[PDB]
Amino acid sequence: PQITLWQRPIVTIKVGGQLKEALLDTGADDTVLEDMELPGRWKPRMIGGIGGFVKVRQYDQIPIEICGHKVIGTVLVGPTPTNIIGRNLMTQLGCTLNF
Amino acid sequence: PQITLWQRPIVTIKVGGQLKEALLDTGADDTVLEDMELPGRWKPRMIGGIGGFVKVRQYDQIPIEICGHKVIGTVLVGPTPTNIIGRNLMTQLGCTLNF
């Protein structure tokens, strides 16, 4: 699709069988999700946002459907104002910024 | 332009007579710049993101030139770790996400 920015660019994602809303965020290097159960082992990571740093759990090679497109990549789980889709997964979508 | 997302989408801006680099962030409601002087009255605000909340000064109707295009909007200033251009200005550039 083509998504304008007059409202938050929120899309429906499917992760671990669950439908969720997530924000397409070109300012985010990584994908950060609200607390949920994910399979496999996790590794520690610290990420920086406008408010400072947060400790997150890093899970690798997690499949997510974003608007019906299947992507598979790293997801970080921790305290966040909302589910955030970052550039790591937007590049798998072939997503670009256009003006 | 069409900007891919393999790297951070960073652009040159001119604001309050200062030239700076800033990150195009589709996930940010608002534009938030590192602490600086801007003309006019301001109001204090607390804005939330990853890492928590940041105290900012809100300036209204500030002209910013982004990649040569003049836009006008509210500009927040405070101790953000990076200059961020939010949706409030990206819309004025006609910027869309496409996949």
Ligand SMILES: CCC[C@@]1(CCc2ccccc2)CC(O)=C([C@H](CC)c2cccc(NS(=O)(=O)c3ccc(C(F)(F)F)cn3)c2)C(=O)O1
């Ligand atoms: C995953 C980290 C993401 C990011 C990284 C910033 C960065 C980049 C390079 C180097 C250092 C730091 C980008 C980002 O959009 C935000 C948040 C939204 C998730 C953000 C950015 C700008 C302003 C705000 N405050 S706000 O009032 O405009 C706002 C509040 C909430 C949301 C919501 F959609 F996320 F809920 C969006 N905007 C928040 C952030 O806090 O850090």
